[PDB]
Amino acid sequence: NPQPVDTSNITIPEKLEYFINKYAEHSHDKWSMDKLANGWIYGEIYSDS
């Protein structure tokens, strides 16, 4: 079943006010903690090296 459900003309209702923002903040904090454990720190100028 390559295409079980078609959502080409399905509109998401605007019932999101706070929970989506909380989930996004939690995901961003988790990603930042992972990158800090990897050895990255916050700064002003991006530098890969």
Swiss-Prot record:
Tissue expression: Highly expressed in heart, lung, cerebellum and brain. Detected at lower levels in adrenal gland, stomach, thymus, esophagus and ovary.
Paired cysteines (S-S): none
PTM comment text: Channel activity is modulated by phosphorylation. Phosphorylation is increased in failing heart, leading to calcium leaks and increased cytoplasmic Ca(2+) levels.
Loss of function: phenotype: Embryonically lethal. Embryos die at about 10 dpc, due to defects in heart tube development. Cardiac myotubes display enlarged rough endoplasmic reticulum and cytoplasmic vesicles that contain high levels of Ca(2+).
Localization terms from the record: Sarcoplasmic reticulum membrane
Similarity comment: Belongs to the ryanodine receptor (TC 1.A.3.1) family. RYR2 subfamily.
Subunit structure: Homotetramer. Can also form heterotetramers with RYR1 and RYR3. Interacts with CALM and S100A1; these interactions regulate channel activity. Identified in a complex composed of RYR2, FKBP1B, PKA catalytic subunit, PRKAR2A, AKAP6, and the protein phosphatases PP2A and PP1. Interacts directly with FKBP1B, PKA, PP1 and PP2A. Interacts with FKBP1A and FKBP1B; these interactions may stabilize the channel in its closed state and prevent Ca(2+) leaks. Interacts with SELENON. Identified in a complex, composed of FSD2, CMYA5 and RYR2.
Function: Cytosolic calcium-activated calcium channel that mediates the release of Ca(2+) from the sarcoplasmic reticulum into the cytosol and thereby plays a key role in triggering cardiac muscle contraction. Aberrant channel activation can lead to cardiac arrhythmia. In cardiac myocytes, calcium release is triggered by increased Ca(2+) cytosolic levels due to activation of the L-type calcium channel CACNA1C. The calcium channel activity is modulated by formation of heterotetramers with RYR3. Required for cellular calcium ion homeostasis. Required for embryonic heart development.
Record's comment describing the protein's domains: The calcium release channel activity resides in the C-terminal region while the remaining part of the protein resides in the cytoplasm.
Name of the protein: Ryanodine receptor 2
Source organism of the structure: Mus musculus (Mouse)
Residues of the full protein shown: 2701 to 2749 of 4966
